[PDB]
């Protein structure tokens, strides 16, 4: 069995978003589910737990007036809703399934987790990135990806043809709340003059496609 | 609420390495403590539990031990698919709490960056914003320092760097820093400079650049 989330969210402060997590019908009978969210680049934080049978829960005290777990038997699905949220509440969330091991404490044996959803909060608005070049034994190029929100992007070079020494670095979030992220790539300094580089940049959030020449 | 402490908090090794991490809580936990193993981009796997159960489908060579405020991962000869982060998780008491992680990675030679310096350009200027980009292309170990420097004066808290994961073929590193300032500012000064310092150089690397030219 697998534990399957919804897709990515993207709020401002002080909406609230409400995650889902498909099991199956023996699954939420026969055992607790967990909630337990990851920052970028951080560790784990504990949520809370409930019992799909009945839906009783228990809160970790950081959570306890804004988070609501439920569970919906007929269609084998639980969910977790956080409200109140704010720009500190960004993370990946993950439902976790809980295996009855641990008698004495009561704790948790988090057996199978589903694959995390992406959960964005910011005062920021949808916006498409503008691409600008940094131009050039070997030589160093790239595309600099600027101001756009919220992730992701990707980057390309010739279509999918050029993957040899690409880099493309994950993004950093600017004062502005806007993200900025580079992509490079090395080639011979005698090409410069012969072959032609474009990156292909995607931010399907904001339907934005932009294909740009880096010539030196 | 309890402190889960792991230590190192990363480790260099090599495949067929014996490898054992630790994990300290601040209270006493019984052996109700479980491992992990997490790659980027994926959920956490269960590997250990009760601190010495190993976790069916587990590989042997995973093993754990343990009590009290004293808990390993030991794994006997490390495999190309164990480089990861592993955590330790305490079942003892609510809030259940997580260590911050011990993560492995493939060590090398010591490898020296190429560094290239950008200049922001003309179509961003024209927009009123101007970004200088400095670019450390396949290094190791991952320890580096870049050094902005603008008419020979010292920035800090102006820029913001990136660093990509452990190349898959050869095991380096990349790291993008990326200086902000006003398009008035980028015109008042002249020379734009980036002194990188790492294990790999006998001595620091500066590329620069003067506006306009």
């Given at each position: 069995?697998?534990?399957?989330?919804?897709?990515?969210?993207?709020?401002?402060?002080?909406?609230?978003?409400?995650?889902?997590?498909?099991?199956?019908?023996?699954?939420?009978?026969?055992?607790?589910?967990?909630?337990?969210?990851?920052?970028?680049?951080?560790?784990?934080?504990?949520?809370?737990?409930?019992?799909?049978?009945?839906?009783?829960?228990?809160?970790?005290?950081?959570?306890?007036?804004?988070?609501?777990?439920?569970?919906?038997?007929?269609?084998?699905?639980?969910?977790?809703?956080?409200?109140?949220?704010?720009?500190?509440?960004?993370?990946?969330?993950?439902?976790?399934?809980?295996?009855?091991?641990?008698?004495?404490?009561?704790?948790?044996?988090?057996?199978?987790?589903?694959?995390?959803?992406?959960?964005?909060?910011?005062?920021?608005?949808?916006?498409?990135?503008?691409?600008?070049?940094?131009?050039?034994?070997?030589?160093?190029?790239?595309?600099?990806?600027?101001?756009?929100?919220?992730?992701?992007?990707?980057?390309?070079?010739?279509?999918?043809?050029?993957?040899?020494?690409?880099?493309?670095?994950?993004?950093?979030?600017?004062?502005?709340?806007?993200?900025?992220?580079?992509?490079?790539?090395?080639?011979?300094?005698?090409?410069?003059?012969?072959?032609?580089?474009?990156?292909?940049?995607?931010?399907?959030?904001?339907?934005?496609?932009?294909?740009?020449?880096?010539?030196? | 609420?309890?402190?889960?402490?792991?230590?190192p908090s990363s480790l260099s090794a090599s495949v067929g390495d014996r490898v054992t991490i630790?994990?300290?809580?601040?209270?006493?936990?019984?052996?109700?403590?479980?491992?992990?193993?997490?790659?980027?981009?994926?959920?956490?796997?269960?590997?250990?539990?009760?601190?010495?159960?190993?976790?069916?489908?587990?590989?042997?060579?995973?093993?754990?031990?343990?009590?009290?405020?004293?808990?390993?991962?030991?794994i006997?000869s490390l495999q190309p698919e164990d480089f990861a982060?592993?955590?330790?998780?305490?079942?003892?008491?609510?809030?259940?709490?997580?260590?911050?992680?011990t993560r492995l990675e493939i060590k090398r030679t010591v490898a020296?960056?190429?560094?290239?310096?950008?200049?922001?350009?003309?179509?961003?200027?024209?927009?009123?914003?101007?970004?200088?980009?400095?670019?450390?292309?396949n290094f190791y170990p991952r320890e580096?320092?870049?050094?902005?420097?603008?008419?020979?004066?010292?920035?800090?808290?102006?820029?913001?760097?990136?660093?990509?994961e452990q190349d898959s073929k050869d095991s380096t590193y990349?790291?993008?820093?990326?200086?902000?300032?006003?398009?008035?500012?980028?015109?008042?000064?002249?020379?734009?400079?980036?002194?990188?310092?790492?294990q790999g150089?006998?001595?620091?690397?500066?590329?620069?650049?003067?506006?306009?030219?």
């Amino acid at each position: 069995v697998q534990l399957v989330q919804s897709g990515a969210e993207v709020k401002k402060p002080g909406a609230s978003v409400k995650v889902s997590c498909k099991a199956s019908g023996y699954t939420l009978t026969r055992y607790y589910f967990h909630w337990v969210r990851q920052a970028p680049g951080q560790g784990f934080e504990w949520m809370g737990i409930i019992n799909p049978n009945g839906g009783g829960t228990s809160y970790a005290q950081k959570f306890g007036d804004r988070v609501i777990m439920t569970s919906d038997m007929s269609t084998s699905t639980i969910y977790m809703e956080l409200s109140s949220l704010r720009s500190e509440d960004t993370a990946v969330y993950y439902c976790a399934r809980d295996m009855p091991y641990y008698h004495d404490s009561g704790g948790p044996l988090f057996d199978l987790w589903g694959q995390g959803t992406l959960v964005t909060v910011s005062s920021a608005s949808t916006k498409g990135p503008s691409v600008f070049p940094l131009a050039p034994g070997t030589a160093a190029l790239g595309c600099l990806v600027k101001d756009y929100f919220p992730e992701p992007v990707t980057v390309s070079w010739n279509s999918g043809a050029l993957t040899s020494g690409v880099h493309t670095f994950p993004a950093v979030l600017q004062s502005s709340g806007l993200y900025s992220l580079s992509s490079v790539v090395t080639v011979p300094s005698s090409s410069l003059g012969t072959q032609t580089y474009i990156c292909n940049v995607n931010h399907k959030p904001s339907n934005t496609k932009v294909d740009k020449r880096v010539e030196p | 609420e309890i402190v889960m402490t792991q230590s190192p908090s990363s480790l260099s090794a090599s495949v067929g390495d014996r490898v054992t991490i630790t994990c300290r809580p601040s209270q006493s936990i019984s052996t109700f403590l479980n491992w992990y193993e997490q790659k980027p981009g994926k959920a956490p796997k269960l590997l250990i539990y009760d601190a010495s159960s190993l976790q069916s489908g587990v590989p042997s060579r995973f093993s754990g031990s343990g009590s009290g405020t004293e808990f390993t991962l030991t794994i006997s000869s490390l495999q190309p698919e164990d480089f990861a982060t592993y955590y330790c998780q305490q079942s003892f008491s609510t809030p259940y709490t997580f260590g911050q992680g011990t993560r492995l990675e493939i060590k090398r030679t010591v490898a020296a960056p190429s560094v290239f310096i950008f200049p922001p350009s003309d179509e961003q200027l024209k927009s009123g914003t101007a970004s200088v980009v400095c670019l450390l292309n396949n290094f190791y170990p991952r320890e580096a320092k870049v050094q902005w420097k603008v008419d020979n004066a010292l920035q800090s808290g102006n820029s913001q760097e990136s660093v990509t994961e452990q190349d898959s073929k050869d095991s380096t590193y990349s790291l993008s820093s990326t200086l902000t300032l006003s398009k008035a500012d980028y015109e008042k000064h002249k020379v734009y400079a980036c002194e990188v310092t790492h294990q790999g150089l006998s001595s620091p690397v500066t590329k620069s650049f003067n506006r306009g030219e």
